[PDB]
Amino acid sequence: EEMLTNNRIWRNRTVDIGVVTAEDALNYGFSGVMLRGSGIQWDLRKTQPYDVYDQVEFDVPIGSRGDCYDRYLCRVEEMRQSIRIISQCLNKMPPGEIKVDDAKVSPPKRAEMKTSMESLIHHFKLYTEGYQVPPGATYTAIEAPKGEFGVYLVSDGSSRPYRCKIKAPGFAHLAGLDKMSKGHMLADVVAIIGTQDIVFGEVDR
């Protein structure tokens, strides 16, 4: 933050660069930082809480103008809040087991596989066949640090998924690139490719 936030060369490359309005950010399927740079108050760890994000305390950085610089400050403050959550989880770590103790779902421990019979059958059948999943379609979405990472997983009832659609943030962000680079030069399109954190493994699948 000392090297880049106060620096005039960084602000001259990020203040006017790639401004995203609010309703167009909701419209193009932007998620996470691309919404939170545009002032949209949306974080999937606070709105639709999963595993124990209801039992940690952290803040959600909200942008002001939607440029590269406000999304930069959103990412820096999310590193701040990540240090906050890591301090809490290093203080609030409970004792217990690490797999679910339902042995038809998770494999058994090795000392209880090399002694017992049912756990040997379950180790054998979980690593050869696997567990059967009930038939049905789900859409499970998390807040990956880019945005909404989602899996639309349709299962037929067997041990192999029938369909696994992967909603990735960088796909919709690189879609919104076509609006975001209107009226800039070559030297700002590289900053727009930056501020949308485009990792092309999730864009291309």
Sheet holding 136-143, edge to edge: 136-143, 148-155, 161-167
Residues in 8-37 at the binding interface with another protein, rule: CB under 8 A? 8-10, 13-14, 24, 26-31
**Which letter does DSSP use for residue 7 in this model?**
-
Bridge partners of 148, per DSSP, are: 143
Smallest separation, CB 59 to another protein (Å): 5
Quick one: which of 18, 20, 38, 40 contacts another protein (CB under 8 A)?
40
CA pair distance 156, 133, nearest whole angstrom: 8
Bridge partners of 165, per DSSP, are: 152
- Judged by CB, which is closer to another protein: 3, or 16? 3
**C-alpha separations of 170 from 1, 29, 32, 175, 183 in Å:** 25, 10, 11, 8, 22
Smallest separation, CB 155 to another protein (Å): 6
Task: Give the three-state DSSP class for 21.
Answer: coil
Quick one: which of 18, 20, 34, 113 contacts another protein (CB under 8 A)?
113
2: contact with another protein by CB under 8 A = yes
Residues in 53-112 at the binding interface with another protein, rule: CB under 8 A? 53, 56, 59-65, 68-70, 72-87, 89-105, 107-112
Chain centre distance of CA 28: 17
Residues in 138-197 at the binding interface with another protein, rule: CB under 8 A? 138-142, 144-146, 148-155, 157-168, 170-172, 174-175, 177-178, 181-186, 188-191, 193-195, 197
